Symmetry: D3
């Protein structure tokens, strides 16, 4: 039958089903190729967490007699899932991505989990030692948003290093959505890195962050190489913006709410002008 909305719907469909111009500058994606799945990617990052921090994300109840069994099953599930997503990435943006290539890259990534665990361990320690409000390594790994963002970042960075396209950005934007912390997979970040609270933090594509660095909520390391360099032991407080070819010397402190466009000598402190 024909209702008053019937022809409105059919006409809408006809218009939506064409667009010779809305073929956009969209290059051609081969039919049959799989597309990145946010769902699969979510599962991938969660398995990575469960493998890196066994028993915390790796099991609902504590059981020392099954830690290894779970690592074994989790690594296999991750391998299958990651192979497919890496294949989707290669296909997105001779070379007609065969699973063979994707499966080896996925295995290469997995071989990096022990190292990722070692690095993330220092990040958790830095988060604990410098946060009186933190009262356990377990509480930090279990619910602190910063560890999740940093974990996603290090996972994405490794994938980028291995040459997996698209997937790395997908993974960091995922953390961006869940934590409000936006770290570009290309950023370079040292050990014992910590982000306090973190909502609004933005770390640009070519940023270089040293060791034992701490950033607070709203801190931006951006531009407009062209991103800032923060040396070791640096602290940047709430909402400060650092942009361009700027180097924050080791041990320096950057007060909050300031637009920083000049180098900051090591061990110095820079704060906003007085208000009245």
């Amino acid at each position: 039958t024909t209702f008053n909305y019937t022809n409105i719907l059919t006409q809408a469909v006809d218009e939506l089903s064409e667009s010779q111009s809305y073929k956009g500058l969209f290059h051609q994606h081969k039919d049959g190729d799989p597309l990145p799945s946010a769902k699969s990617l979510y599962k991938i990052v969660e398995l990575a967490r469960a493998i890196i921090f066994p028993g915390y994300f790796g099991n609902s109840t504590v059981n020392s007699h099954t830690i290894n069994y779970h690592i074994g099953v989790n690594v296999e599930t991750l391998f299958g899932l990651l192979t497919e997503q890496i294949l989707a990435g290669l296909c997105f943006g001779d070379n007609e991505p065969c699973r063979e290539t994707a499966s080896l890259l996925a295995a290469r990534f997995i071989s990096k989990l022990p190292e990722l665990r070692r690095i993330l361990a220092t990040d958790v320690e830095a988060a604990y030692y410098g946060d009186p409000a933190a009262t356990c390594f377990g509480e930090i790994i279990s619910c602190y948003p910063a560890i999740r963002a940093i974990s996603n970042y290090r996972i994405a960075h490794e994938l980028l290093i291995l040459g997996v396209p698209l997937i790395p950005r997908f993974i960091t934007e995922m953390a961006h959505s869940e934590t409000g912390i936006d770290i570009h997979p290309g950023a370079q970040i040292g050990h014992h890195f910590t982000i306090d609270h973190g909502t609004g933090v933005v770390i640009g594509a070519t940023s270089i962050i040293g060791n034992n660095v701490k950033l607070y909520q709203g801190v931006t390391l951006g531009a407009k190489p062209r991103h800032p360099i923060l040396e070791d032991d640096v602290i940047v407080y709430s909402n400060a913006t650092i942009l361009g070819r700027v180097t924050i010397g080791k041990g320096a402190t950057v007060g909050g709410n300031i637009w920083v466009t000049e180098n900051v000598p090591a061990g110095s402190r820079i704060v906003q002008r007085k208000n009245k």
Copy 2:
């Protein structure tokens, strides 16, 4: 049986099940009326995305031979879902909202999808052309949070224009939660709009934004008409606050971390005072 917690629970229930005062200034909602469903609304926005960007949210694998089939099925699912939610909105806040009224409004909205696609297309282009870190239209549509917030906004705005109450705000707050970007459905926003990173962005109810405007994370366009006006080609950097009857002239640049309460002449640049 009676445990030590038994009477505590029953007494709690008795107290919670009364409140003659907690009938609040809550007007009376008719029994039988459906209430807005965040779940249905989520599905609605996702279908809208899949219809606006066919094959990106419209299918898990690439298949040019089924794009139209999916648009047809998706439009129908959206129509059914949207009719019910619009009905819930009308019922929330002679006129005893009949589905008949809601179904036509839902169809009217759908007839606007081709235009929404045209506008959003310019937003994606602006996001690509001004972001060296962006490397594909596909990557932008697929995982950039800004496009999701802007999409939700334009969808909500149209619904507001059509006179659908409550639902528009529901939709923007949804993006607010998922991206950290808060745009009031009543704001007016031009073509080629882009938000870089975006967490913390706040765009007030009566804001007017021109064409080719770019906002960074933490930027607020608020007050306390009474919201700012940004002319074409304006850029507002990280965490800047613009409030009141303020006009940012075309081509002007607003540095970050500044409280702007005065008009900004066209083509000029305003930055925070030096620090030391």
Copy 3:
């Protein structure tokens, strides 16, 4: 069979399944003990909402004839779920946490829901009366992110007061993720509290906030007792940072984008220095 990735995977598992050093400073968690479940905790907070605001989160359709039935069922579901999570908290960080202890604490919490409803009611009123963009108590409770964060906070605070470890922080970080609003469960907050927009708001562990206080997006109440004290009727605009032993006098107004490290007299106004 042996593929090229086979031995890579097995070697990865072997390395991941040891770590005598990665036993970390992680104290020993007893085998058999349940661990906190973000999933159960999500259900817990949602039930709390449905009980505090009956019919809004308590039912998909309006029905005055079943409000009490739903409160009864919801209180029971909450009780079961909360008992288990409280038990997990006690076990995390003579005293070998018996469900008996956890069940009474869970019941004690539930007996506080009537009071929580009374307090939250004032928060909703404050959100309505001071937000021209707000047009109904129902719209506020239903989709405003601030009410969700404040609700989670008051729920977590009560749990903290009752002596439930870990779970309170879990609950606030949950709101942190969903709204971008980070309130430490230990903060003390008065009636008629409101947060406008809120993404990026950070309220430190020992902060004390009076009655009728309003905070905007990006506002930080932190440090580095050692957290700020805001007296009644205070307003802090966008992105302002207040840190240390600072007291904001009643009725005072703190402009946005400023680093505040000094006391602010009552009824006064402090704004950022002019820009040029």
Copy 4:
């Protein structure tokens, strides 16, 4: 792109999307009308069970303090679901089925639950008292397939009596699938009815079964009024077939594996001829 299977798929779709003859003797179903949902129907029968046998299907844990709350919530959920399905039935096969008609029928059905509980109670008693293998009323209600089939039947019969088309048969076939027991909704069955084991039992549309009757697996009451009549206290053993205008007198016993086409006097016994 075009693969070897591409044109095969498109041609298949073209052929499947026509059929002027396969419009069959299928009468025309109005666009917009809802169709019966096996999913909703499953939920409906489960709620009916939970309401008829409170606490058995009505709650995962025993709690005398919430039985009534659950009955209240369950009745409401059932009402909503049943209204829609009854509407679908009326629409399937002036009279353009308005929910108004369906909602009252749904309420009428619900008003019959107390009586259904009374009748089913006698069926459970008969199942217990005549089954030495049965050791509790609770075990019978909880997992005996016969009670489920008989429950579905009595539910469907009442719906048939009220004039709800299609839905009754849907409900009995549901039990048919789950238990192997096929009872036509039109059959008439007395109190204290029991089916032992039951797989393969078939009870025809116009069958009339008295009180305290017991049937075993594979028993058929069919034909080809034209279905059998079983008086009180009758027992029919395994796989026996009773067809046509046949009356099994009260207290009679029908042995298994026999084709019965003649009346069976009351109190008599009929068995298969000897084998050798």
Copy 5:
């Protein structure tokens, strides 16, 4: 820690994780190969139904304007799913099954759906015309178990014909479980086939059934070529067993509850000996 059940569990695992003998006569299944998924197979059969009977299983609400869209989407989903399962079948029991082979077979099957629809249409007609209890083609397709079993059978038979191993039996056993009707995929069955009630029906691997044949519940066509042949217009009543090299002549009737091991002349009737 070590509980009293700890070592019992570990010892159980050790014993279960070996078995050099329980490598059974199980041939070696290549690592990496996918195994048949009952879950995917369920989805496959449901999509086949929705495509064969458009709008009945193809949509929750009636909509003539979207029938074709749904057929298009459903055919694609089916194609993807069926390709994988066929690949699993080939792998189960030079020839190292490439998806290429499986995808073409899957497409070949799909090209048979129009014909399957034509045949099944006659089965539905036979079910209606010979069942006074049937009152609509729609009611039959929608909930009659026989149509589901017969549909699964014809689907499985075609797959068998195309040379797909394992999957066909999987599909018929699926119907066997859901309806109590067991038809071997190798059986040959003519048009206008109908099964009344059907629980307990068993149709052997090499059975040949003519046109317009009707079988009742519990009927077995088995053995121990070596299975029965039923010519056109044959009817076999409840629980009758036909085995071996037996031919039931056209138009013949086989009464219920009888062990038939001899040929049955055309147009004749054979019934169980009298009882007393």
Copy 6:
């Protein structure tokens, strides 16, 4: 508001929420006790299958490198689930069932899985060797309904032997529903047992079945010790009923469709009288 169905619903609830008589002969179930969960029980049986037949139900893809990992994880999941259900059984029908008792019984059951695997292995072999239609051990374990019923039975029997009440019957009725095969947990069944097709098979509580016995669909071993005894190498064809104190001698064959109430000498054959 008050609709025409409003008071009908409230009155129904009032009537349903009382019943001093419908407290039935239902003994009192302690508040707080968990009730048997068909859902948990389903998971339990599926895990048991995956552990008994590793890689068949134990993983979606073939992987010899992870068989043991999966057995380890599966045994743990099963242990947790089974402990709770056994506790529910003990509570159903001094002795106030403590999890301590249930956990040891659950572990005791698990220690029996290696033996169950050994016995079931003979059942699979018997199903293969005597079924020309069977073409692989893998096909049998993967989709043959008989193996599922027999597996559930042996699992339930062991639980019965260990003294777990209620749960065993729950488990067999589960198989009864899924396969149409009803085996009482108390039956005693020898090795190399096979059921061909099986729908309608009924094996009574005190039945004793020897080794290498085969039963066909519809076969009943019942009564009304008091159940039949079948010695080794016995075969009972389709729909035959054996009841009472009857012994079927070894190597004997019982034809189908016959009511057997007398002993059957070893090696003999008994068939239905001729028909005409």
